[PDB]
Ligand binder design. Structure first.
Ligand SMILES: Nc1ncnc2c1ncn2[C@@H]1O[C@H](COP(=O)(O)OP(=O)(O)O)[C@@H](O)[C@H]1O
Lengths: 100, 238
């Protein structure tokens, strides 16, 4: 029915919402784990998910749920930049140069 | 400078049938097409960034899923690799494997070696500071695996307004062995106050965090990147 781990239903709800395009009330706050992953899933981060599956027919329904989680996750995009820090003096030099 | 768009990468790894599946005679269901597609019986194809069959070695997993992340973090991007899938599907095999075995070790130990191999060959003007932290989340509570007296760490926001675990042990490291010492330490500590590791590890998330800071001492610019390496609790339903 529901995921054994409530942080995993929270994570499926977060990926679903993001895959849908909703990103308003995406439920990151439903768990500490989805709070920690907030930046990896909708912030400034290059994220890679390795979905692991059994190839047995006995596990088929769980396998399909894992593949669907991956297929939804793969559609998510992030806007990313390196984390560069400039001292105030260098930052002001670039500004003046960019301003002239 | 303008930022860039990038999709979350998804790699799918099918492990070999296990002892019980083989003894029960289980059929192998997936069908592979090219390097990216998998079909289950008559279902529509699933296309990922990579599909890795049972015959993939740990080093092939690492090259397909994690090698690029290490380069990206060393350019100053934040990077995250998490494993997802039902209990026994192969998540810990993938992220840890047999930690000190050159052939069976998984992603975390290989990143511990590769970050240093890249750093040794970088620009002579750079000064490096790498700190690691190792924690787990169980029933929505964070326990520091490097200090198991702290069993309810809080999440705060850093200077860039990014959430982080506050009060977590941080260890500076300067070699792949010092990184692996932390992992050995946290693996042993995790048994403390756990009365069933098989169940506990299946219901808990394990997070290894490697914070890589670089300073160009001549240009005065700094870059930093946090690399989260997460082994999620199992995703199965009740
Ligand atoms: N790729 C693989 N190659 C060989 N054995 C594997 C592989 N993936 C999983 N296993 C086996 O399955 C067992 C459970 O795998 P694991 O990594 O612990 O699953 P999870 O962490 O998802 O619960 C491991 O002890 C091992 O016997």
């Amino acid at each position: 029915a529901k995921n054994i781990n409530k942080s995993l239903s929270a994570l499926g709800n977060v990926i679903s919402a993001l895959a849908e395009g909703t990103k308003t009330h995406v439920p990151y706050r439903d768990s500490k784990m989805t709070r920690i992953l907030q930046d990896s899933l909708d912030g400034n981060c290059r994220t890679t998910i390795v979905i692991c599956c059994s190839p047995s027919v006995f596990n088929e329904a769980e396998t399909k749920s894992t593949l669907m989680f991956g297929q939804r996750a793969k559609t998510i995009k992030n806007t990313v930049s390196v984390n560069l820090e400039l001292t105030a003096e260098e930052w002001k030099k670039k500004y003046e140069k960019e301003k002239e | 400078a303008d930022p860039a768009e990038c999709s979350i990468k998804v790699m799918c790894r099918f492990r070999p049938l296990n002892e019980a599946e083989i003894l029960r005679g289980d059929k192998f269901i997936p069908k592979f097409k090219g390097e990216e597609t998998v079909v289950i019986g008559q279902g529509k194809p699933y296309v990922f960034d990579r599909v890795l069959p049972p015959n993939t070695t740990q080093e092939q997993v690492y090259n397909a899923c994690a090698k690029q992340i290490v380069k990206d973090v060393l350019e100053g991007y934040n990077g995250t690799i998490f494993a997802y899938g039902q209990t026994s599907s192969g998540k810990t095999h993938t992220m840890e494997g047999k930690l000190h075995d050159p052939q069976l070790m998984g992603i975390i130990p290989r990143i511990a070696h590769d970050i240093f191999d890249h750093i040794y060959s970088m620009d002579e003007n750079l000064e490096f500071h790498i700190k690691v932290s190792y924690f787990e989340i169980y029933l929505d509570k964070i326990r520091d695996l490097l200090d198991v007296s702290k069993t309810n760490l809080a999440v705060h926001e850093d200077k860039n307004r990014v959430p982080y675990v506050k009060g977590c042990t941080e260890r500076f490291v300067s070699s792949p062995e010092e990184v692996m010492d932390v992992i050995d330490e946290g693996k042993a500590n995790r048994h403390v106050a756990v009365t069933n590791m098989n169940e506990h590890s299946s219901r808990s998330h394990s997070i290894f965090l490697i914070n890589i800071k670089q300073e160009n001492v001549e240009t005065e610019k700094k870059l930093s990147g946090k690399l989260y390496l997460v082994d999620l609790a199992g995703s199965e339903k009740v």
